[PDB]
């Protein structure tokens, strides 16, 4: 279950960077950017394998890849933010 809908402005500014790179299909900072997200925990609505892809939201000052991601779905503006390695997701409202 998707935990509501968070304003893009309430997310780290790096989330906007990730959205830009999704739109340009890169170049991406991490090797796992663009891989299929399996949604094994049924947090997001069930869809075909390959419906969802995952991308890093860089954590500033982090040595590693951290816990922040955007998962894309296929539908118009269908993008989800997680700040905890997929444990929970919010829909990203790019209008606020």
Swiss-Prot record:
Which SUPFAM superfamilies did the record assign? Microbial ribonucleases
Which reactions is this enzyme annotated as catalysing?
[RNA] containing guanosine + H2O = an [RNA fragment]-3'-guanosine-3'-phosphate + a 5'-hydroxy-ribonucleotide-3'-[RNA fragment]
Q: What is this protein called?
A: Guanyl-specific ribonuclease Sa
Query: Member of which family?
Result: Belongs to the ribonuclease N1/T1 family.
Q: Where in the cell is it found?
A: Secreted
Q: Name one GO molecular function term.
A: ribonuclease T1 activity
Q: Which domain of life does the protein's organism represent?
A: Bacteria
Q: What is the effect of changing residue 39 to A/D/S?
A: Decreases protein stability
**InterPro entries cross-referenced by the UniProt entry:** N1-like, Ribonuclease/ribotoxin
Spell out the CDD domains in the cross-references. Answer: RNase_Sa
User: What Gene Ontology terms describe where this protein resides (cellular component)?
Assistant: extracellular region
Identify the catalytic residues: 54 (proton acceptor), 85 (proton donor)
Where would you say this protein principally sits, based on its record?
secreted
Q: What is the lineage of its organism?
A: Bacteria, Bacillati, Actinomycetota, Actinomycetes, Kitasatosporales
């Amino acid at each position: 279950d998707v935990s509501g809908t968070v304003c893009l402005s309430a997310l780290p500014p790096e989330a906007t960077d990730t959205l830009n790179l999704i739109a340009s299909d890169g170049p991406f900072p991490y090797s796992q950017d663009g891989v299929v997200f399996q949604n094994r925990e049924s947090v997001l609505p069930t869809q075909s394998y390959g419906y969802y892809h995952e991308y890093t939201v860089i954590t500033p000052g982090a040595r590693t890849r951290g816990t922040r991601r955007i998962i894309t779905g296929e539908a118009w503006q269908e993008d989800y933010y997680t700040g905890d390695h997929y444990a929970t997701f919010s829909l990203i409202d790019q209008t606020c």
